[PDB]
C-alpha cells in the first residue's frame, strides 16, 4: 500500500532470503542493524520500491558490510565492506553484552579484585557499556565493551545499590579476551538495599488513592488506516518505527479546509547521548549513545493496558530483525491514544454578552525503552491548534558509584556510602521540514529592546528581529533565553492571506547543552550536543548527527562534516537538528528508583493559518 507502511515480518524474512541467496548472510553473519529506507526524493516513479539497509557483522572477525537490498525486486542494490577503524564499528549486539560477565568471571585479575573486596563472583553483575574512543591504541579496529561491577545479594535484589568502585575491566567481545582489568583501590560497597518492592522499604502501601476512569464510549476520534496511517482532528501522518530511532513520524500534515498542507516531512530523535561528568578513571570514559551505539528501538518495552497506558489505547506492534535476520515483533511497543488537555480558548465578553469556552485535546504517540538502569519514554503530541510537541521522560534507577569519604564535586550522595555521578541526557531531534512543501528557510528571532528617546519618548517600545540563515556555515546556533530566542521555519513562497510567508516557530526549553570540555573525546564524538540548533540541506545519506557508525568512532563524521559543505538553505529542502537535554545532579529523592523528569520542545504555527484553526471546534 503506502510506501510508509511499517516493515512486516514478511519483508524481514525476504531480506534474509535475499541476503542468503546473495551469499551475504552465512552462519557467521549477524545483522547488527536492519531498517527500511524512506521513499527517495522525487515521488513515486511507479510502484513502491521497498528498500532495506543492513549492517552485517562477522563473528569470525572478517570486515563487516553495509548492504541495501530491494525486497521488491529481490535484489541487492549495493554491499560495501567497511573499514571500521576508519569509519566506525557497528552497533553493539545483544550476544556481545552477555559475553562480558561470563568472561570476567574466569579471569584471574578480575577474581583477584573481587577477592580483595570479599565479593562472591557469582553475585557480581557487570554492566557492559560501550567503550568509546580514548588512549587505548590496541582498541582501534576491535569491538570493546567496558565493564562495571554491581553486587546482587539475591535474585530479586537491585544490584545498582551496590556498586563496586575502584574497578573496571575492558573486554574484546569478538576474540572474547579480557584486555584489561584496572583496580584503582578498594571502596566500601554500599550496604543498604534499594529494593523498592520490599515492604520493609516501601512500608504499608497507601490506601488513599481513589480510581480515575478515562473512557471513550464511542471509541477514539482518530483512525488508524493502512496499518500506521493516522488521521485525527485535521492532522494526517504515518507512524513509522526503526530499531535505531524508535517511533519516527512521516508526512505530518494539516487539513486546512480543502488543502492537506504539509508541515514536517520526517520527525525523529536521531541521537541520544548520556555523558558522565565524574573524572574518576573508573567512569570518565562513560558515554552512552543510546540511539547510535545501542539502538533504542531494539529495547522498546511491551506497553500494557493500564500500567503504561490509561484510556482508550490503540497499540501498534512493530517488527524488527533479530541477529539472524528473522522477524521479531515488539508487541504493543507503540501506544496511541488521544487525551483531554484543559481549555483551548475562552472569553466572557461584557459588551456582547457572549460567554465562550472550548476544550483542548492532544493525540499522543509514544513508546518506552529500557537501556540497562534507565528507562526513557518518548512522546510526540499533536494539538487541535496546530502545535507539535515532543517530550522525553527519564526514569529508572540512577547509575551508582561509591560516595567518596571527603565528599565530591562530581558525585552526589544518595544513601550512606552510595554515590551518583553527575551526567546529562542530551537528545537530537531531526526535523526534516516541509512547511507547505519543501522550499523552506530558517530565521532566528530575538526580542529587541529599544532605547527611550526620539520615536520612543516614554521608553516602552520593544520589537523583534529575524535573521535568515542562508548558508550551512551560519546555521549552527545557540540558545538565548534572555532575548527570547526562537527559530522560525517558513516557506518564502507560500504566503498567508496577509501576504506573509507561512511558518512554524520552534520553542526550545533552553536547557544547558554539552558541558564537557571542547577538546574532549565526547565533545568531538557528540559535537551536535554542543549547540542548540543546526540547519542542513537535505541529503539522503545525512541521517544521524553523529554519523552511521557511532560505536568506537572518533570525530570526523556527523553534523560538523555535513555543515562544512556550506550548502544553500535559504528556500531549499532543509532539515532542522535540535539539541535538548537534562543535566542531572542526582538527589536523594531519585533513590531507590527515580521519579520521572522531563525535557522537550514544541513548534507552534506562526502565520501558517489565515486565522485560528480551531473556530470549528464544537461547544460540546
Annotated binding site for Cu cation: 423, 425, 584
* Residue from 50, 53, 244, 584 binding Cu ion (CB under 5 A): 584
Please, which of residues 524-583 interact with a copy of itself by CB under 8 A?
A: 583
Rounded to the nearest whole angstrom, what is the least distance from the CB of residue 590 to Cu ion in the complex?
A: 8
Residue partners of 228: CB distance under 8 A and separation at least 6: 4, 5, 6, 238, 239, 240, 316
Q: Does 459 participate in binding a copy of itself (rule CB under 8 A)?
A: yes
Q: How far separated are the first and last CA of the chain, in Å rounded?
A: 37
Specify the stretch interacting with a copy of itself by CB under 8 A; choose among 266-274, 373-381, 433-441, 564-572: 373-381
- Nearest CB to a copy of itself, comparing residues 175 and 197: 197
Strands 423-433 and 418-421, sheet pairing: unpaired
Specify the stretch interacting with a copy of itself by CB under 8 A; choose among 163-171, 412-420, 433-441, 572-580: 412-420
- Nearest CB to a copy of itself, comparing residues 542 and 606: 606
Residue pair 80/101 in contact (Cβ under 8 Å)? The answer is: no
Grid cell 571542547 is found at: 518
Specify the stretch interacting with Cu ion by CB under 5 A; choose among 27-35, 153-161, 328-336, 580-588: 580-588
* Residue from 43, 45, 46, 156 binding a copy of itself (CB under 8 A): 156
- Nearest CB to a copy of itself, comparing residues 80 and 448: 448
Residues forming a β-bridge with 501? 495
Count of positions on this chain that bind a copy of itself (CB under 8 A): 151
Grid cell 523498592 is found at: 196
Residue pair 90/64 in contact (Cβ under 8 Å)? The answer is: yes
Known binding-site positions for substrate: 288-299, 371-376
197 is written with which cell numbers? 518492592
* Residue from 193, 393, 495, 602 binding a copy of itself (CB under 8 A): 393
Residue pair 535/444 in contact (Cβ under 8 Å)? The answer is: no
What stretches of 324-402 adopt beta strand conformation (E)? Answer: 327-329, 334-348, 355-371, 374-383, 388-396, 401-402
Rounded to the nearest whole angstrom, what is the least distance from the CB of residue 594 to Cu ion in the complex?
A: 7
Count of positions on this chain that bind Cu ion (CB under 5 A): 1
- Nearest CB to a copy of itself, comparing residues 255 and 471: 255
Q: Does 604 participate in binding Cu ion (rule CB under 5 A)?
A: no
Rounded to the nearest whole angstrom, what is the least distance from the CB of residue 232 to a copy of itself in the complex?
A: 8
Q: Is 589 helix (H, G, I), strand (E, B) or coil?
A: helix
User: Cα separation of 22 and 12, whole Å?
Assistant: 15
- Nearest CB to a copy of itself, comparing residues 108 and 120: 120
Rounded to the nearest whole angstrom, what is the least distance from the CB of residue 596 to Cu ion in the complex?
A: 11
Known binding-site positions: 288-299, 371-376, 423, 425, 584
Q: Does 591 participate in binding a copy of itself (rule CB under 8 A)?
A: yes
Q: Does 310 participate in binding a copy of itself (rule CB under 8 A)?
A: yes
Please, which of residues 341-370 interact with Cu ion by CB under 5 A?
A: none
* Residue from 5, 180, 328, 359 binding a copy of itself (CB under 8 A): 359
Buried b (16+ CB within 10 A) or exposed e, 224-256: beeebbbebbbbbbbbbbbbbbbbbbbbbbbeb
Q: Does 613 participate in binding a copy of itself (rule CB under 8 A)?
A: yes
- Nearest CB to Cu ion, comparing residues 83 and 597: 597
Q: Please indicate whether residue 349 is annotated as part of the active site.
A: no
Q: Please state the separation of Cα 408 from the chain's center in Å.
A: 30
61: left (phi over 0), alpha (psi -120 to 50) or beta: left
Q: Does 37 participate in binding a copy of itself (rule CB under 8 A)?
A: no
Q: Please indicate whether residue 290 is annotated as part of the active site.
A: yes
Nearest in space to 283 (alpha carbons), one of 416, 171, 130, 110: 130
Catalytic residue among 276, 374, 504, 562: 374
Rounded to the nearest whole angstrom, what is the least distance from the CB of residue 461 to a copy of itself in the complex?
A: 4
Q: Is 310 helix (H, G, I), strand (E, B) or coil?
A: coil
User: Cα separation of 524 and 530, whole Å?
Assistant: 9
User: Cα separation of 49 and 511, whole Å?
Assistant: 42
Q: Does 283 participate in binding Cu ion (rule CB under 5 A)?
A: no
- Nearest CB to a copy of itself, comparing residues 42 and 217: 217
* Residue from 113, 594, 599, 603 binding a copy of itself (CB under 8 A): 594
106 binds, among Cu ion, a copy of itself, none (CB under 5 to 8 A by kind): none
Q: Is 351 helix (H, G, I), strand (E, B) or coil?
A: coil
* Residue from 291, 439, 440, 521 binding a copy of itself (CB under 8 A): 521
Nearest in space to 399 (alpha carbons), one of 412, 380, 386, 385: 412
Q: Does 340 participate in binding a copy of itself (rule CB under 8 A)?
A: yes
Q: Does 615 participate in binding a copy of itself (rule CB under 8 A)?
A: yes
Grid cell 570493546 is found at: 144
Quick one: which H or E segment has residue 110? Answer: helix 108-115
Specify the stretch interacting with a copy of itself by CB under 8 A; choose among 172-180, 219-227, 436-444, 554-562: 219-227
User: Cα separation of 270 and 534, whole Å?
Assistant: 13
286 is written with which cell numbers? 562513560
* Residue from 46, 258, 349, 540 binding a copy of itself (CB under 8 A): 349
355 is written with which cell numbers? 460567554
What is the DSSP annotation of 230-291?
EEETTEEEEEEEETTTEEEEEEEEEEETTEEEEEEEEEEEEEEEEEB----TTTTT-EEETT
Specify the stretch interacting with a copy of itself by CB under 8 A; choose among 40-48, 64-72, 113-121, 591-599: 591-599
- Nearest CB to Cu ion, comparing residues 531 and 584: 584
* Residue from 27, 185, 342, 406 binding a copy of itself (CB under 8 A): 342
Specify the stretch interacting with Cu ion by CB under 5 A; choose among 323-331, 523-531, 579-587, 601-609: 579-587
User: Cα separation of 376 and 355, whole Å?
Assistant: 42
Rounded to the nearest whole angstrom, what is the least distance from the CB of residue 172 to a copy of itself in the complex?
A: 21
Residue pair 177/110 in contact (Cβ under 8 Å)? The answer is: no
* Residue from 377, 501, 547, 600 binding a copy of itself (CB under 8 A): 377
Query: Annotated active-site positions, please?
Result: 290, 374
Amino acid at each position: 500500500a503506502s510506501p510508509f507502511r511499517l516493515a512486516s515480518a514478511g519483508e524481514i524474512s525476504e531480506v534474509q532470503g535475499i541476503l542468503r541467496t546473495a551469499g551475504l548472510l552465512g552462519p557467521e553473519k549477524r545483522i547488527a542493524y536492519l531498517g527500511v529506507l524512506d521513499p527517495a526524493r522525487g515521488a513515486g516513479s511507479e510502484a513502491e520500491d521497498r528498500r532495506f539497509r543492513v549492517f552485517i557483522h562477522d563473528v569470525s572477525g572478517a570486515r563487516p558490510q553495509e548492504v541495501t537490498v530491494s525486497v521488491t525486486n529481490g535484489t541487492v542494490i549495493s554491499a560495501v565492506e567497511l573499514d571500521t577503524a576508519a569509519t566506525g564499528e557497528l552497533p553493539v549486539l545483544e550476544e556481545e553484552f552477555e559475553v562480558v560477565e561470563q568472561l570476567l568471571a574466569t579471569d584471574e585479575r578480575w577474581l583477584k579484585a573481587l577477592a580483595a573486596r570479599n565479593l562472591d563472583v557469582s553475585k557480581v553483575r557487570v554492566a557492559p557499556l560501550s567503550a568509546g574512543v580514548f588512549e587505548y591504541a590496541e582498541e582501534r579496529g576491535r569491538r570493546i565493551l567496558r565493564g562495571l561491577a554491581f553486587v546482587q545479594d539475591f535474585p530479586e535484589d537491585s544490584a545498582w545499590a551496590h556498586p563496586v568502585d575502584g574497578l573496571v575491566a575492558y573486554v574484546d567481545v569478538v576474540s572474547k579476551e579480557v584486555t584489561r582489568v584496572i583496580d584503582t583501590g578498594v571502596f566500601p560497597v554500599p550496604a543498604e538495599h534499594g529494593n523498592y518492592t520490599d515492604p520493609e522499604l516501601t512500608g504499608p502501601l497507601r490506601t488513599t488513592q481513589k480510581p480515575i476512569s478515562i473512557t471513550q464510549p464511542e471509541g477514539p476520534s482518530f483512525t488508524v488506516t493502512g496499518g500506521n496511517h493516522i488521521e485525527w482532528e485535521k492532522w494526517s501522518l504515518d507512524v513509522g518505527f526503526d530499531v535505531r530511532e524508535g517511533v519516527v513520524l512521516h508526512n505530518i500534515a494539516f487539513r486546512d479546509g480543502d488543502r492537506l498542507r504539509p508541515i514536517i516531512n520526517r520527525a525523529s530523535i536521531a541521537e541520544m547521548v548520556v555523558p558522565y561528568g565524574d573524572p574518576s578513571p573508573i567512569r570518565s570514559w562513560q558515554n552512552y549513545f543510546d540511539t547510535g551505539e545501542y539502538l533504542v528501538g531494539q529495547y522498546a518495552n511491551s506497553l500494557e493496558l493500564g500500567c503504561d497506558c490509561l484510556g482508550d489505547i490503540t497499540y501498534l506492534s512493530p517488527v524488527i530483525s533479530d541477529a539472524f535476520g528473522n522477524p521479531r515483533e515488539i508487541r504493543n511497543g507503540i501506544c496511541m491514544h488521544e487525551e483531554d488537555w484543559g481549555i483551548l480558548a475562552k472569553h466572557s465578553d461584557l459588551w456582547s454578552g457572549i460567554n465562550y469556552t472550548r476544550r483542548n485535546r492532544r493525540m499522543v504517540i509514544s513508546f518506552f525503552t529500557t537501556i540497562g538502569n534507565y528507562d526513557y519514554g518518548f512522546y510526540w503530541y499533536l494539538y487541535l491548534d496546530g502545535t507539535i510537541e515532543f517530550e522525553a521522560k527519564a526514569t529508572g534507577v540512577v547509575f551508582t558509584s561509591a560516595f567518596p569519604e571527603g565528599g565530591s564535586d562530581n558525585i552526589s550522595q544518595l544513601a550512606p556510602g552510595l554515590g551518583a555521578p553527575f551526567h546529562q541526557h542530551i537528545f537530537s531531534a531531526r526535523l526534516d521540514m516541509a512547511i507547505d512543501g519543501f522550499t523552506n528557510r530558517v530565521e532566528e528571532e530575538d526580542v529587541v529592546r529599544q532605547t527611550m528617546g526620539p520615536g520612543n519618548e516614554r521608553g516602552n517600545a520593544f520589537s523583534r528581529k529575524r535573521t535568515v540563515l542562508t548558508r550551512e556555515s551560519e546555521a549552527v546556533r545557540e540558545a538565548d533565553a534572555r532575548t527570547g530566542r526562537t527559530w522560525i521555519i517558513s516557506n518564502p513562497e507560500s504566503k498567508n492571506r496577509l501576504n506573509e510567508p507561512v511558518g512554524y516557530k520552534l520553542h526550545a526549553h533552553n536547557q544547558p547543552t554539552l558541558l564537557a570540555d571542547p577538546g574532549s573525546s565526547i565533545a568531538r564524538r557528540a559535537a551536535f550536543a554542543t549547540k542548540d540548533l543546526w540547519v542542513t540541506r537535505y541529503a539522503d545519506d545525512e541521517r544521524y548527527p553523529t554519523g552511521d557508525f557511532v560505536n568506537q568512532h572518533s570525530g570526523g563524521a556527523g553534523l560538523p562534516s555535513y555543515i562544512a559543505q556550506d550548502r544553500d538553505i535559504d528556500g531549499q529542502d532543509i532539515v532542522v537538528w535540535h539539541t535538548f537535554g537534562l543535566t542531572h545532579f542526582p538527589r536523594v529523592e531519585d533513590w531507590p528508583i527515580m521519579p520521572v523528569d522531563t525535557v522537550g520542545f514544541k513548534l507552534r504555527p506562526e502565520g501558517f493559518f489565515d486565522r485560528s484553526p480551531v473556530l470549528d471546534v464544537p461547544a460540546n
